[PDB]
Design an enzyme around this catalytic site. Structure first.
Site, PDB file in Angstrom:
ATOM      1  N   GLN A  20      -0.227   1.190   5.534  1.00  0.00           N
ATOM      2  CA  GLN A  20       0.110   2.192   4.530  1.00  0.00           C
ATOM      3  C   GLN A  20      -0.251   1.742   3.118  1.00  0.00           C
ATOM      4  O   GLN A  20      -0.368   2.562   2.219  1.00  0.00           O
ATOM      5  CB  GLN A  20       1.590   2.564   4.605  1.00  0.00           C
ATOM      6  CG  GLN A  20       2.563   1.468   4.184  1.00  0.00           C
ATOM      7  CD  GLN A  20       4.005   1.845   4.519  1.00  0.00           C
ATOM      8  OE1 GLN A  20       4.382   1.939   5.693  1.00  0.00           O
ATOM      9  NE2 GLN A  20       4.810   2.074   3.493  1.00  0.00           N
ATOM     10  N   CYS A  26       5.542   5.462   4.905  1.00  0.00           N
ATOM     11  CA  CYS A  26       5.920   5.018   6.243  1.00  0.00           C
ATOM     12  C   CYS A  26       6.286   6.169   7.174  1.00  0.00           C
ATOM     13  O   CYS A  26       5.973   6.129   8.370  1.00  0.00           O
ATOM     14  CB  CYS A  26       7.076   4.009   6.190  1.00  0.00           C
ATOM     15  SG  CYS A  26       8.623   4.650   5.529  1.00  0.00           S
ATOM     16  N   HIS A 164      13.124   2.904   6.628  1.00  0.00           N
ATOM     17  CA  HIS A 164      11.736   2.677   7.016  1.00  0.00           C
ATOM     18  C   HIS A 164      11.398   3.335   8.357  1.00  0.00           C
ATOM     19  O   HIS A 164      12.002   3.033   9.391  1.00  0.00           O
ATOM     20  CB  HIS A 164      11.459   1.165   7.012  1.00  0.00           C
ATOM     21  CG  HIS A 164      10.057   0.792   7.368  1.00  0.00           C
ATOM     22  ND1 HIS A 164       8.959   1.257   6.674  1.00  0.00           N
ATOM     23  CD2 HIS A 164       9.569  -0.038   8.323  1.00  0.00           C
ATOM     24  CE1 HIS A 164       7.860   0.759   7.205  1.00  0.00           C
ATOM     25  NE2 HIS A 164       8.202  -0.037   8.204  1.00  0.00           N
ATOM     26  N   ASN A 188       4.629  -0.972  13.665  1.00  0.00           N
ATOM     27  CA  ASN A 188       4.912  -0.858  12.240  1.00  0.00           C
ATOM     28  C   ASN A 188       3.620  -0.381  11.587  1.00  0.00           C
ATOM     29  O   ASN A 188       2.618  -0.205  12.273  1.00  0.00           O
ATOM     30  CB  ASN A 188       5.352  -2.225  11.701  1.00  0.00           C
ATOM     31  CG  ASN A 188       6.022  -2.148  10.330  1.00  0.00           C
ATOM     32  OD1 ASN A 188       6.221  -1.073   9.775  1.00  0.00           O
ATOM     33  ND2 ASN A 188       6.362  -3.306   9.777  1.00  0.00           N
TER      34      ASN A 188
HETATM   35  C1  LIG Z   1       8.371   3.887   3.880  1.00  0.00           C
HETATM   36  O1  LIG Z   1       7.488   2.831   4.013  1.00  0.00           O
HETATM   37  C2  LIG Z   1       9.591   3.450   3.450  1.00  0.00           C
HETATM   38  O2  LIG Z   1       9.854   2.296   3.783  1.00  0.00           O
HETATM   39  C3  LIG Z   1      10.475   4.282   2.544  1.00  0.00           C
HETATM   40  C4  LIG Z   1      11.405   3.475   1.622  1.00  0.00           C
HETATM   41  C5  LIG Z   1      10.781   2.196   1.200  1.00  0.00           C
HETATM   42  C6  LIG Z   1      11.365   0.925   1.292  1.00  0.00           C
HETATM   43  C7  LIG Z   1      10.567  -0.195   0.995  1.00  0.00           C
HETATM   44  C8  LIG Z   1       9.216   0.003   0.631  1.00  0.00           C
HETATM   45  O3  LIG Z   1       8.295  -1.044   0.334  1.00  0.00           O
HETATM   46  C9  LIG Z   1       7.155  -1.280   1.175  1.00  0.00           C
HETATM   47  C10 LIG Z   1       7.642  -1.710   2.534  1.00  0.00           C
HETATM   48  C11 LIG Z   1       6.246  -2.352   0.584  1.00  0.00           C
HETATM   49  C12 LIG Z   1       6.281  -0.065   1.348  1.00  0.00           C
HETATM   50  C13 LIG Z   1       8.687   1.279   0.569  1.00  0.00           C
HETATM   51  C14 LIG Z   1       9.466   2.383   0.860  1.00  0.00           C
HETATM   52  N1  LIG Z   1      11.301   5.062   3.432  1.00  0.00           N
HETATM   53  C15 LIG Z   1      11.207   6.491   3.532  1.00  0.00           C
HETATM   54  O4  LIG Z   1      10.203   7.126   3.253  1.00  0.00           O
HETATM   55  C16 LIG Z   1      12.540   7.068   4.192  1.00  0.00           C
HETATM   56  C17 LIG Z   1      12.904   6.388   5.608  1.00  0.00           C
HETATM   57  C18 LIG Z   1      13.418   7.299   6.693  1.00  0.00           C
HETATM   58  C19 LIG Z   1      14.730   7.274   7.137  1.00  0.00           C
HETATM   59  C20 LIG Z   1      15.127   8.162   8.133  1.00  0.00           C
HETATM   60  C21 LIG Z   1      14.216   9.063   8.658  1.00  0.00           C
HETATM   61  C22 LIG Z   1      12.908   9.076   8.200  1.00  0.00           C
HETATM   62  C23 LIG Z   1      12.510   8.189   7.217  1.00  0.00           C
HETATM   63  N2  LIG Z   1      12.637   8.585   4.023  1.00  0.00           N
HETATM   64  C24 LIG Z   1      13.313   8.772   2.779  1.00  0.00           C
HETATM   65  O5  LIG Z   1      13.296   7.830   1.944  1.00  0.00           O
HETATM   66  O6  LIG Z   1      14.145   9.732   2.692  1.00  0.00           O
HETATM   67  C25 LIG Z   1      14.691  10.165   1.493  1.00  0.00           C
HETATM   68  C26 LIG Z   1      14.328  11.592   1.177  1.00  0.00           C
HETATM   69  C27 LIG Z   1      13.034  11.866   0.726  1.00  0.00           C
HETATM   70  C28 LIG Z   1      12.657  13.182   0.459  1.00  0.00           C
HETATM   71  C29 LIG Z   1      13.580  14.213   0.649  1.00  0.00           C
HETATM   72  C30 LIG Z   1      14.873  13.932   1.112  1.00  0.00           C
HETATM   73  C31 LIG Z   1      15.247  12.615   1.389  1.00  0.00           C
END
Ligand SMILES: *[C@H](O)C(=O)[C@H](Cc1ccc(OC(C)(C)C)cc1)NC(=O)[C@H](Cc1ccccc1)NC(=O)OCc1ccccc1
Length: 221
Positions: A20, A26, A164, A188
């Site tokens: 990604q 993710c 994630h 992943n």
């Molecule tokens: C994607 O890579 C994610 O990991 C992201 C959060 C995050 C943590 C750490 C990093 O750093 C790197 C690892 C280097 C990229 C990046 C990003 N998570 C999401 O996109 C989440 C996870 C999730 C949980 C449950 C079901 C699906 C996905 N989705 C999200 O954050 O939700 C919040 C939201 C967004 C939009 C509308 C409503 C809620």
């Protein structure tokens, strides 16, 4: 119930690990992964799907491009949209671009999704019967960032606050480890240089370790 080992890669359900990059996408990779699996089940063709299509276009469904999103919103977009383009036709750029969706290159579709009940036994069943499942996990830990080998277990992990999206492609057990010996096999999206060739074995049946069963779903196609 269920086999003692499952591995959808060996049946050809799974595309190579992707990366990604510096984009909070993710959720899109987990979703294309689940969809790639279900389209394969339907058609016998394994076609890499466009995460960029999901990033640029599923705003209406509730996704936030490189800032985050949910797998179910992605599945909902594919349904709402009547399709999803291939990776090759709509390649990954790892930033937010104008929605470039062209139905002429749609190679996928779905009719919604199914959310799995919040229990590992139920995840086991879904993986055994359906194919790869989209799941979210609490990945926010040094030990995860720097994971390389073995069954991942993190004491401070949360089963309720996952951050994630990843893809469960099977499950198994260490003939090595057999005390707390089972694991989910998890694809992943951080490239092949992370973990075991881009994969991680997440602790299985350890009371929903890292929340792996707390947000599992798949597209119906
Ligand atoms: C994607 O890579 C994610 O990991 C992201 C959060 C995050 C943590 C750490 C990093 O750093 C790197 C690892 C280097 C990229 C990046 C990003 N998570 C999401 O996109 C989440 C996870 C999730 C949980 C449950 C079901 C699906 C996905 N989705 C999200 O954050 O939700 C919040 C939201 C967004 C939009 C509308 C409503 C809620």
């Amino acid at each position: 119930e269920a086999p003692r080992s499952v591995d959808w890669r060996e049946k050809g359900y799974v595309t190579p690990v992707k990366n990604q990059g510096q984009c909070g996408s993710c959720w899109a990779f987990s979703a294309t992964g689940a969809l790639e699996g279900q389209m394969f089940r339907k058609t016998g063709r394994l076609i890499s799907l466009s995460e960029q299509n999901l990033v640029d276009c599923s705003g209406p469904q509730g996704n936030e491009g490189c800032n985050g999103g949910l797998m179910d919103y992605a599945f909902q977009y594919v349904q709402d949209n009547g399709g999803l383009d291939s990776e090759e036709s709509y390649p990954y750029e790892a930033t937010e671009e104008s929605c470039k969706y062209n139905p002429k290159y749609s190679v996928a579709n779905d009719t919604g999704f199914v959310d799995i009940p919040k229990q590992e036994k139920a995840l086991m069943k879904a993986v055994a019967t359906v194919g790869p499942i989209s799941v979210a996990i609490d990945a926010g830990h040094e030990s995860f960032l720097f994971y390389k080998e073995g069954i991942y277990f993190e004491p401070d992990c949360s089963s309720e606050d996952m951050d994630h999206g990843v893809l469960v492609v099977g499950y198994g057990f260490e003939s090595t480890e057999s005390d707390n010996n089972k694991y989910w096999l998890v694809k992943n999206s951080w490239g092949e240089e992370w973990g075991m060739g881009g994969y991680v074995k997440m602790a299985k049946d350890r009371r929903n370790h890292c929340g792996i069963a707390s947000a599992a779903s798949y597209p119906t196609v």
